[PDB]
Amino acid sequence: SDTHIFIIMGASGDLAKKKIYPTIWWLFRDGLLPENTFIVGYARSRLTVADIRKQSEPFFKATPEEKLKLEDFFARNSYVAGQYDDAASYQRLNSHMNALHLGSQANRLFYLALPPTVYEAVTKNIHESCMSQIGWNRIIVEKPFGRDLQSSDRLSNHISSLFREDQIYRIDHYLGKEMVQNLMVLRFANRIFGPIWNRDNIACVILTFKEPFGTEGRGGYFDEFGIIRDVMQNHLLQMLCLVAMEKPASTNSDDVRDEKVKVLKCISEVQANNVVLGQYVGNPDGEGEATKGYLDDPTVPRGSTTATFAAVVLYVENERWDGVPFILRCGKALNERKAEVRLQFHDVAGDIFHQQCKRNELVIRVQPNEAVYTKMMTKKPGMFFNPEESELDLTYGNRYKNVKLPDAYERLILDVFCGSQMHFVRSDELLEAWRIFTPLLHQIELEKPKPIPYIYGSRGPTEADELMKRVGFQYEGTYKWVNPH
């Protein structure tokens, strides 16, 4: 029943236009926001709410029946022009917020839809000029959080000198995805997954992020950070933590994040011996973008060695996981779009089926086509006695046909309104993540190894499969699945 103000810093930018304004509209439309909520845009351009509406409403997918809700939404919107390090401008923004209904008392949520080069100036000026003295104040920050241990150190130190940890909401948007959030319930609400979730039963864990398209003419931005910073140090490592963590003392946000940091503290720095890097080249037999390699993007520097693919093996050196390889595999221009967690279990001990069994697997497919299934052995159906691979399956598209699955940003923004930090990256989480990868990132920067070429649309360099086999992953190619429609 308190007033809430949602401040979109960088309201003129593309992320605000296509993602943040549509998301806050969808939450508003669905009745999920506090009744007394206002939206304030802030950016350099001299805009009006009319301009904000013209630019973003095409992405709202509004229906004719939503006309009244839409009018109320934009009546609750306003816009303040100003520079990002100009004190007087933030004084104008603060006075503007105070003048809203109960604006002095309101809770204030600042979304930094801005490039990281202005994070320090924006957070400094918000702290100096725009904090509520009565309501809470929360800041939402998106990546990049630095480029390595040192650069993340400095950003984190600046922000923490101003804001308490319970005011900082760092987005990793995979933490907003349906099946990523499900990892904790699958693991800790089920006896069928409890006593087997350990090194005595698990031979290897595979965390996968694949996209079938290349850089799409935007490689110049990607070239400055590469695939490990892009997808592995954040999304894949987050999935690792949720797969590996001990059971938390409760589902309180910091009991959960405590257990995630504890996992990271038992991972040593990755070394090049456990790393395979690739860069995609064009497929002469392909069509369209598939004929073009990474270096065929004219925004990519000539002779770039930036990796578009990486397979990395990590180890969690604790009692539950000692010696179990965690394989993190990701890349662009591969054969499919897929984000997935896979457990491969050890062979059954004391084989009585004359070497016909294959290792069980548990698969949590995050996207597309959200699903959980366990590959297991069944008696070959019919007049046969030999075991054959089959699966127990849960596919959301068929089990939950009419259930809307919210976008990650819908879920995460709502969490900030509700004060739940469970699905946001804590300061110490971030530090450990950079600790694990910075020696490798510095060696790549220093020595500039040439990545292994792989053809657009392939599974990546075969050396990645060899690395996975070396550490204990077994692939047979015997499993046959066809959709029961």
Ligand X SMILES: NC(=O)c1ccc[n+]([C@@H]2O[C@H](COP(=O)([O-])OP(=O)(O)OC[C@H]3O[C@@H](n4cnc5c(N)ncnc54)[C@H](OP(=O)(O)O)[C@@H]3O)[C@@H](O)[C@H]2O)c1
Catalytic residue positions, numbered: 235
DSSP class of residue 257 equals H
Q: Where are the beta strands (DSSP E) in 229-308?
A: 275-281
Collapse the DSSP code of 482 into the 3-class scheme (helix H, G, I; strand E, B; otherwise coil) and give the result.
coil
Q: How far is it between the farthest Cα atoms of the chain?
A: 83
Site string for ligand X, 386-425 (x = CB under 6 A): -----x-x-x------------------------------
Neighbours of 321 (CB within 10 A): 22
Q: Which is nearer to ligand X, 363 or 408 (CB)?
A: 363
Answer for the pair 358, 391: CB distance below 8 angstroms, yes or no.
no
Residue 475 makes contact with ligand X by CB under 6 A: yes
Question: Which residue's entry shows tokens 């809470």?
Answer: 136
Pairing of strands 338-345, 361-367: antiparallel
Could you say which residues in the range 361-380 bind a second copy, by CB under 8 A? Answer: 362, 372-374, 376-379
Please tell me whether 272 is known to bind a ligand.
no
Give the C-alpha separation, 292 to 298, whole Å: 11
Please choose, from the candidates 242, 280, 236, the residue with its C-alpha nearest in 3D space to the C-alpha of residue 262: 242
Give the C-alpha separation, 407 to 371, whole Å: 16
As given in the structure block, the two tokens for residue 282 are 């064009």
Residue 208 makes contact with ligand X by CB under 6 A: yes
Q: How far is the CB of 151 from ligand X (least distance, A)?
A: 32
Question: Which of residues 403, 446, 476, 478 is near a second copy by CB under 8 A?
Answer: 403
Cα-only R_g, the chain = 24
Residue 465 makes contact with ligand X by CB under 6 A: yes
User: Can you say how many angstroms the Cα of residue 256 is from the centroid of all Cα atoms in its chain?
Assistant: 17
Residue 394 makes contact with a second copy by CB under 8 A: yes
* Binding site, annotated residues: 10-17, 44, 119, 143, 173-177, 211, 230, 329, 332, 337-338, 342, 365, 367, 373-375, 393-395, 459, 475, 481
List interacting residues with a second copy (CB under 8 A): 32, 178, 181-182, 184-186, 188-196, 200-201, 247-251, 345-348, 350, 352-353, 357, 359-360, 362, 372-374, 376-379, 381-383, 385, 387, 390-396, 398-401, 403-406, 410-411, 414, 484-485
List interacting residues with ligand X (CB under 6 A): 208, 338, 342, 363, 369, 371, 373, 391, 393, 395, 459, 465, 468, 475, 479, 481
* Binding site, annotated residues for NADP(+): 10-17, 44, 119, 143, 329, 338, 342, 365, 373-375, 393-395, 459, 475, 481
